[PDB]
Design a protein around this ligand. Structure first.
Ligand SMILES: CC[C@@H](NC(=O)c1ccc2c(c1)c(C)c(C)n2Cc1ccc(F)cc1F)c1ccccc1
Lengths: 263, 263
């Protein structure tokens, strides 16, 4: 509607984005390049550095367990569950979300967290590795693909997406509106009242379009390129669940399986 | 109406919202079925062997006492899945050590099932089959030994617990307090667990004061009910040790077995 109101929505989403996500992209980019404050993350590049990292980095997912490739997949599921709760808190700050049907709120989050997890995973990724444990570590890309089959292929697609996605050079204020657009997708299966969802998303898309033009004046059709990335996000989520269904045939704890019943 | 009350009320609203999304049969719906004030919510009442056989196909050639006991396990296992889903929504729960998350769910899931079971109970019986059925207290008490002495401690607690007249918004915070118990055996980090419960205990005190202003010291009486919950769990595990050695042709559900392992 009003151009000034769209900037108010952009400022609101960014303020909530900071409160909901501790390790922002700006903080992650400072770690991946050097914030002139030392505190460089512990790098995991092989099996020996991984065993040293577990004795130094405070890992809160070390259950009595036997192969190494399972532990790494276990750690990435612990963080995923933490991420879902961060996204859920952020989704509640989107204007109009809490007023939606309660079943629709659950549906929008059920199918949206995966696409948001990979979107924000790109903020912690360069072409050589990904930050882990709130930025205290850095697991190299070569060490991830050196894992045995099929555990050596569940991160390479995210790297291929991140290197293309990070080329857009979006900051946290851009991602805050972009993440809100993904959550309010009116085409999620099982929605009961699509109209208010699309109404809010069309309002978020107007805010994102004005945000990208003011924050990236020299990027011609960046708004269009960012919408094309949403298509690539659903391709990986579909590709990941196919690899996830291969899992459950190899990892064969009852109470632990209920906490991680998804993803 | 200070700023501290704002966060406590926000925490109460968050938990109640997660409570509704995690449990499909709330106390409000349970009471609307039992009070019998409509026509579409009337349940089928099972009171003898005849009405038991009459109420079939409610959306094996086993013994009646065995078949009903097997049905209690499936609902218990399904309840563990719902409590596990609600636990992840408690702020800070998924950020704790993974072994502590399992330990809190291991010892907390019993005290919550019997707490919410009171919502489905009155003086004369308990709702079953998602509220479509209603099994009387005397029919369950008439089952062969020792299957007839399973539900009596639960009915006695429910009658005294329901006298507090708590609604779902009160139960949402009280259930969160039960999960974040820092006295569970085998915990690694008690300080982060006690910090979360102190916040939940603070939110429960304000919730009960605003929702039950005429009820004097309801917060103290609600906390004292933990003694009765512990007594039921102790009596329940003693009975299961009898069936384990008398009914060697059946076993508990694997998810239930892991909960009962050790303590
Ligand atoms: C803590 C786990 C504990 N579970 C119970 O003690 C229990 C018993 C009966 C319950 C319930 C919980 C609940 C939630 C309901 C609604 N019921 C009534 C009910 C519902 C459906 C039906 F088919 C028959 C019914 F009796 C348990 C552990 C191990 C083995 C068996 C049970």
């Amino acid at each position: 509607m009003e151009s000034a109101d769209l900037r108010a929505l952009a400022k609101h989403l960014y303020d909530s984005y900071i409160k909901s996500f501790p390790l922002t992209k700006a903080k992650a980019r400072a770690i991946l390049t050097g914030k002139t404050t030392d505190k460089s993350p512990f790098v995991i590049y092989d099996m020996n550095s991984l065993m040293m990292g577990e004795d130094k980095i405070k890992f809160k997912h070390i259950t009595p367990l036997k192969e190494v490739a399972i532990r790494i997949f276990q750690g990435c599921q612990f963080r995923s569950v933490e991420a879902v709760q961060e996204i859920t808190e952020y989704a509640k700050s989107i204007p109009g979300f809490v007023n939606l049907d309660l079943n629709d709120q659950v549906t929008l989050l059920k199918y949206g967290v995966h696409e948001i997890i990979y979107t924000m995973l790109a903020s912690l990724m360069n072409k050589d590795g990904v930050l882990i444990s709130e930025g205290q570590g850095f697991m190299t890309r070569e060490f991830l693909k050196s894992l045995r089959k099929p555990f050596g292929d569940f991160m390479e697609p995210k790297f291929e997406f991140a290197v293309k996605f990070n080329a857009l050079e979006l900051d946290d204020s851009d991602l805050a509106i972009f993440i809100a657009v993904i959550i309010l997708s009116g085409d999620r299966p099982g929605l009961l009242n699509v109209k208010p969802i699309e109404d809010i998303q069309d309002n978020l898309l107007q805010a994102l379009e004005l945000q990208l033009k003011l924050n990236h004046p020299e990027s011609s059709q960046l708004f269009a390129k960012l919408l094309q990335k949403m298509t690539d996000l659903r391709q990986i989520v579909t590709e990941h669940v196919q690899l996830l269904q291969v899992i459950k045939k190899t990892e064969t704890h009852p109470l632990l399986q209920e906490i991680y019943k998804d993803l």
